[PDB]
């Protein structure tokens, strides 16, 4: 049967656990869990019944990604390789049930010119890595915080953010090209034209008013991921878990 896959930027795994992440996992039982912004050193006992692969950043409390699964992992790959993205613990992958699952955390450029230029540069290198992965031809599912909203429908305040990191013209164009290289935006496919977000700031009732951005993605090639929605029944981090069904063949 199909596998339930969840991608989730936890904003610090220990913080998410304190808010109830293990309880959410106990109830929802994703077959594959792709985590971003783990921050912590590996915590293989945190979610009972899950095998885990961890790729922490060099800096304490910073970035870090992980893949957890109820089925055994195969060919765990830590990093790309890429000097800076590996130092920041931003990409991990493993094969589960014949599908290459990748957990990716792309950098924010919000802090200023320095990190925006970093983001622009490493996203070209990340695109090269993804395109080579697609040319290999094995089925792939990417769960990632990309820190990019694609179209106007993807953020409530689009008119006020066309000059802000995450919605800059070249970043929207990058996302179009990312999908055109051979990836389906599974949440958008499942939503049609409906608006749904994956991140809300902690400032000024933004979560309750649904003033959000869609910056987390489930992207697929060679396999369909259906039923994808954000889960807003919990507030385990600034993001919502994004979950759907991977229709294995």
Numbering used by the authors: 33 to 281
Q: What do the study authors state?
A:
In the present study, we showed that DR_0354 protein (DrXth), the exonuclease III homolog, possesses AP endonuclease, 3′-phosphodiesterase, 3′-phosphatase, and 3′–5′-exonuclease activities. In the present study, we characterized the unique ExoIII family AP endonuclease DrXth from D. radiodurans, which is widely distributed in Deinococcus species.
The fully active, N-terminal truncated enzyme containing residues 23–283 (NΔ22DrXth) was purified and crystallized. The overall structure of DrXth is composed of 12 β-sheets surrounded by 9 α-helices, forming a two-layer structure core. Distribution of the electrostatic surface potential of DrXth revealed a central active site pocket with a negatively charged groove surrounded by a positively charged surface, which corresponds to divalent metal ion and DNA binding sites, respectively, as observed in the structures of other AP endonucleases. Additionally, the loop region connecting α3 and β3 displayed a noticeable deviation due to the lack of five residues between Pro80 and Gly81. The catalytic residues in the active site, namely Asn41, Asn43, Glu69, Asp177, Asn179, Asp248, Asp270, and His271, were superimposed with equivalent residues in the structures of other AP endonucleases. Based on the structure of DrXth, mutation of Gly198 to His or Ala was likely to prevent the enzyme from flipping out the abasic ribose. The side chain of either His or Ala could affect the entrance of DNA substrates, indicating that a Gly residue was crucial for DrXth function.
